Amino acid sequence: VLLKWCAHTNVELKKAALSALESFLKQVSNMVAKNAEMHKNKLQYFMEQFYGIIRNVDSNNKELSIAIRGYGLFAGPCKVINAKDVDFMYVELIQRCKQMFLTQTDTGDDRVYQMPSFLQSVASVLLYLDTVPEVYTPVLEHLVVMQI
DNA sequence: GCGTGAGCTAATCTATGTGAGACTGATGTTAACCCTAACCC
């Protein structure tokens, strides 16, 4: 229902719905991380929903941005049950950024909006990351410079 | 992704009226208690 509300007119309700959605994902990530992971079904469903949202063209920037943000928040408490899954993370996101908006003289066609979500998401996984691959760090620096 | 202005139809919003539910008190009716034409032993 929150996602359905997010796709609506009367931009005031749109803002309220997106804020509620972001708060709901932030909270659910909080109690997911706050305890030992014994509810992996919810995490799997959330990841599947996020992948479905981001691997199709039917949405505006708001839903893609919120899916990316939720991806970032749930990056944190994913390594507890699935080690080296975080290692998979921080790699797909950077490659996505590189193929999306790393070509100079941006012919993006409305790609700027999703960028701060990318920075928040990559930071979130960065906090709980060990042994940085040290190869994509130039890409991360380029990304931060581009966002600035 | 988002501001900004125009027209519209939905939503009031009070004035006035009408009826349903609760109430209250004056009233008249029935009734307890006793007295009275009249006779006549």
UniProtKB/Swiss-Prot annotation:
Signal peptide: none annotated. It is found in: Nucleus; Nucleus, Nucleolus; Cytoplasm, Cytosol. Autophosphorylated at two clusters, the T2609 cluster and the S2056 cluster. Autophosphorylation induces a conformational change that leads to remodeling of the DNA-PK complex, requisite for efficient end processing and DNA repair. It comes from the Eukaryota. HEAT repeats lie at residues 1-28. Belongs to the PI3/PI4-kinase family. It is linked to Immunodeficiency 26 with or without neurologic abnormalities: A form of severe combined immunodeficiency characterized by reduced or absent T and B cells, recurrent candidiasis, and lower respiratory tract infections. Some patients show dysmorphic features, severe growth failure, microcephaly, seizures, and impaired neurological functions. DNA-PK is a heterotrimer of PRKDC and the Ku dimer (composed of XRCC6/Ku70 and XRCC5/Ku86). Formation of this complex may be promoted by interaction with ILF3. Component of the core long-range non-homologous end joining (NHEJ) complex (also named DNA-PK complex) composed of PRKDC, LIG4, XRCC4, XRCC6/Ku70, XRCC5/Ku86 and NHEJ1/XLF. Additional component of the NHEJ complex includes PAXX. Following autophosphorylation, PRKDC dissociates from DNA. Interacts with DNA-PKcs-interacting protein (KIP) with the region upstream the kinase domain. Serine/threonine-protein kinase that acts as a molecular sensor for DNA damage. Involved in DNA non-homologous end joining (NHEJ) required for double-strand break (DSB) repair and V(D)J recombination. Must be bound to DNA to express its catalytic properties. Promotes processing of hairpin DNA structures in V(D)J recombination by activation of the hairpin endonuclease artemis (DCLRE1C). Recruited by XRCC5 and XRCC6 to DNA ends and is required to (1) protect and align broken ends of DNA, thereby preventing their degradation, (2) and sequester the DSB for repair by NHEJ. This is DNA-dependent protein kinase catalytic subunit. It comes from Homo sapiens (Human). The gene is PRKDC. The chain holds residues 296 to 443 of 4128 of the full protein.
